[PDB]
């Protein structure tokens, strides 16, 4: 007598009128004239924006920093729209359209002679940011497959997550810090300048606490 269990119900769920992902433009409608500095800190450290779920229950979670150019947006849109069931699934963008101008110099040119002309636009992303959020009358196992396919093709470490798996991820990291048996932690040594270690550390390490190196996020670091 195989024991059956109640199936989850999605009767309260409601699908928006436009379920598919909308088109993202290569560049903003009004082209930017003022050229901007490189500002690599915009992809460094933990994300503070778009870290929580809004409408849907599933999403792709960024595990590193990186820039999303238009080519990536087309990969995400075409893959998800083609793979999703419009009747039972809906997807929304959790990242703005490319807005940061990237300059390039003419091929074969020497150093100097002023800054290069604007070439294309990108969207900066920090680790911990939700990139695309999906919802509807479906389970995580249904969308995990094609969401993971998209995550692998992003220019940074990423993984498909849900409301449950995301919360479990954060709870596990909090538990590891609480039950850690190493009496020495990067936080304690850095904030107290023990051994004069701050002579080889960045001011950002006081808040990053050894979990971030450049654009890379180290999830096993406590």
């Amino acid at each position: 007598v195989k024991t059956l269990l109640p199936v989850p119900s999605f009767e309260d769920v409601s699908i928006p009128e436009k379920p598919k992902l909308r088109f993202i433009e290569r560049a903003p409608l009004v082209p930017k004239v003022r050229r901007e500095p490189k500002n690599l800190s915009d992809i460094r450290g933990p994300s503070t924006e778009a870290t929580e779920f809004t409408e849907g229950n599933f999403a792709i979670l960024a595990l590193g920093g990186g820039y999303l150019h238009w080519g990536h947006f087309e990969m995400m849109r075409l893959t998800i729209n083609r793979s999703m069931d419009p009747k039972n699934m809906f997807a929304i963008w959790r990242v703005p359209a490319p807005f940061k101008p990237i300059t390039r110099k003419s091929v074969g040119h020497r150093m100097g002679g002023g800054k290069g002309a604007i070439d294309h636009y990108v969207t900066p992303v920090k680790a911990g940011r939700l990139v695309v959020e999906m919802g509807g009358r479906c389970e995580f196992e249904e969308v995990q497959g094609f969401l993971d396919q998209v995550a692998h093709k992003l220019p940074f470490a990423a993984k498909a997550v849900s409301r449950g798996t995301l919360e479990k991820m954060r709870k596990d990291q909090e538990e590891r810090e609480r039950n850690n048996q190493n009496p020495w932690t990067f936080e304690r040594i850095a904030t107290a300048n023990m051994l004069g270690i701050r002579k080889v550390l960045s001011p950002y390490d006081l808040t990053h606490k050894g979990k971030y190196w450049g654009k890379f996020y180290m999830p096993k670091r406590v």
């Binding site: 003419s106 074969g108 040119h109 020497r110 100097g112 002679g113 002023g114 800054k115």
Partner: peptide, 18 residues
């Protein structure tokens, strides 16, 4: 050897007022 461009931003060389 390619012929390069020039910067279009002039001025901006004022010293600090102290």
């Amino acid at each position: 050897k390619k012929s390069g461009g020039s910067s279009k931003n002039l001025g901006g060389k004022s010293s600090g007022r102290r």
